Structures are given as C-alpha cells and as structure tokens.
C-alpha cells in the first residue's frame, strides 16, 4: 500500500484526485489547505518521490512547467485512505448523516 | 493548526474518532492499518503530543474506565480533514455515487 506516505505526500495525491494540475497549481492548492506558504524546495522533491513510486505521472509541457496526474495506483491510494477514514468515522447514524450532507453539498456546488 | 499534524498523528485521531480507546487498542488499530508493528515509543510520545495540543484527553468514563478520547477540538480536526478530502474527491457525479456507496456499506456493517 501507500499507507506509509507523509501527510504532505498524501495531500498532493488528494489534490490530483480532483484533477490533473501543473506544479504551480498544486502548490497553490496546498497553500490554501495549509494556510501557509509551501516552498518549491519541499513540493518538487516530493512530486519526484511520488512519480518514482508510480503514484503520479508527469507530462512535460515546455521547460518550466509540467502537468502531474494520478496513476491508477495513486488513485487506489486515495480511495484506500478515504475508505479507512470513513470506516472509522461512520460510527453511528449521526456520523452517517454528517458525511452524507458533506458529500451532497460538495456535489451540488459543482 | 491541526492541518500541520503528521500522518501518524492524524491516524491516531482517526482511530479515536471511531470510539475512545485504551492505548494498547489504539496500537492494534494502527498496526492493522499499517500492516507493520507500531512500537510503544512511537505511539505514546505522539499521544502525549496530541494531549498537549488539546486534541486528545485521558477521559474517565466511570470509576474503572480511563481511556484516550478526542476533545471537541480533536473531533473538529477530524471533521475538517474529512471535509477537505471530500471536497477534492467528490469531483463529479460518479465520485459522489462512489462515496455514497462506501458510506452505505459502512452503515450496513454497524
Ligand atoms: Cl507526515
Ligand atoms: Cl507531512
Ligand atoms: Cl495524512
Ligand atoms: Cl490547474
Ligand atoms: Cl508549473
Ligand atoms: Cl499555474
Ligand atoms: Cl482519507
Ligand atoms: Cl479500510
Ligand atoms: Cl446516532
Ligand atoms: Cl456527527
Ligand atoms: Cl439521515
Ligand atoms: Cl449534518
Ligand atoms: Cl479500547
Ligand atoms: Cl492500554
Ligand atoms: Cl500499549
Ligand atoms: Cl487492550
Ligand atoms: Cl485495514
Ligand atoms: Cl488529559
Ligand atoms: Cl468525539
Ligand atoms: Cl480525510
Ligand atoms: Cl474544506
Ligand atoms: Cl471512481
Ligand atoms: Cl444498505
Ligand atoms: Cl448487510
Ligand atoms: Cl443489509
């Protein structure tokens, strides 16, 4: 599994689970999550790690810009952790109601 | 913030989101997740960290039950990360349906 990834690496995969993105756009999504700046020197070595692990695929677009996307193995890692999180969180009917409301509101906002 | 926690620390919170637990029980749940041993010396220093951060407490349910449990702030942290994860995962109708099915199957197992 990918269950030994860092939180930062897992968050990259979560970002790419929404859609494929350029490196700079991943950085912005992570900054919005953390509420803090994310340095290029942290992001890109971690992207290279995820590509080497087969969880992310890279597509070069010019010379300063790459597009990154989940592989199926990377998507499986996102789903695996979501399934585990939900298995623990959905502990009674009120928890089930909370989750279902979140999902339906996210879908309605699309 | 709770968004700066390590993956290991976030996984403790997830375990306690299911129910309050004795330390040895947290260890078991984490070992089932990771598929590798989790040493005393990794788990308990991090439990102490989460207590000092106000996310976990030692609770005394009755006179003979003293377990680890989420504080209100710890529960907020678990919900906050689930909300962010779902906001990125629920990216179209098929993703919506997938999460609905995960939740329904979890609920049925209760
Ligand atoms: Cl981490
Ligand atoms: Cl991290
Ligand atoms: Cl994480
Ligand atoms: Cl983008
Ligand atoms: Cl870029
Ligand atoms: Cl960009
Ligand atoms: Cl998750
Ligand atoms: Cl699971
Ligand atoms: Cl309930
Ligand atoms: Cl709830
Ligand atoms: Cl309901
Ligand atoms: Cl609700
Ligand atoms: Cl227990
Ligand atoms: Cl114990
Ligand atoms: Cl123990
Ligand atoms: Cl026990
Ligand atoms: Cl498992
Ligand atoms: Cl305490
Ligand atoms: Cl709680
Ligand atoms: Cl999550
Ligand atoms: Cl959010
Ligand atoms: Cl899907
Ligand atoms: Cl059902
Ligand atoms: Cl059933
Ligand atoms: Cl049934």
Place of tokens 């375990």: B15
Q: Give the tokens for residue A42.
A: 């942290």
- Cα torsion at A73, A76, A82, A88 (round to 10°)? -110
A37 touches B at CB < 8 Å: no
What are the chain B neighbours of A15 within 8 Å (beta carbons)?
Answer: 88
Q: Give the tokens for residue B42.
A: 């990794």
Q: Do B82 and A87 touch (CB under 8 A)?
A: no
Q: Biggest alpha carbon distance in chain B?
A: 50
CA distance B80 to chain A (A): 10
Burial A16-55 (b: 16+ CB within 10 A, else e): bbbebbebeebbebbeebeeeebeeeebeebbeebbeeeb
Other beta carbons less than 10 A from residue B13's beta carbon: 20
Residue among B33, B79, B96 whose CB faces A103 most closely: B96
Which residues form the domain of A79?
A: 1-110
What are the chain B neighbours of A85 within 8 Å (beta carbons)?
Answer: 14, 82, 85
**For chain B, what is the domain count?**
1
Residues forming beta bridges with residue A59, ordered by sequence position: A67
What is the stated resolution of the deposited model, in angstroms? 1.5
Q: Do A6 and B6 touch (CB under 8 A)?
A: yes
CA B74, chain centre distance (Å):
9
Question: Rounded CA gap, B89 and B5, in Å?
Answer: 21
């Amino acid at each position: 599994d990918a269950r030994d990834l860092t939180a930062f690496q897992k968050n990259i995969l979560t970002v790419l689970g929404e859609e494929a993105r350029y490196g700079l756009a991943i950085k912005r999504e992570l900054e919005e999550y953390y509420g803090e700046e994310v340095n290029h020197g942290r992001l890109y070595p971690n992207l290279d790690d995820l590509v080497n692990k087969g969880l992310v695929e890279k597509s070069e677009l010019d010379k300063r810009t790459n597009e990154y996307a989940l592989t199926n193995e990377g998507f499986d890692a996102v789903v695996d952790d979501l399934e585990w999180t939900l298995s623990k969180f959905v502990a009674d009917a009120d928890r089930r109601e909370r989750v279902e409301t979140i999902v339906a509101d996210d879908a309605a906002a699309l």
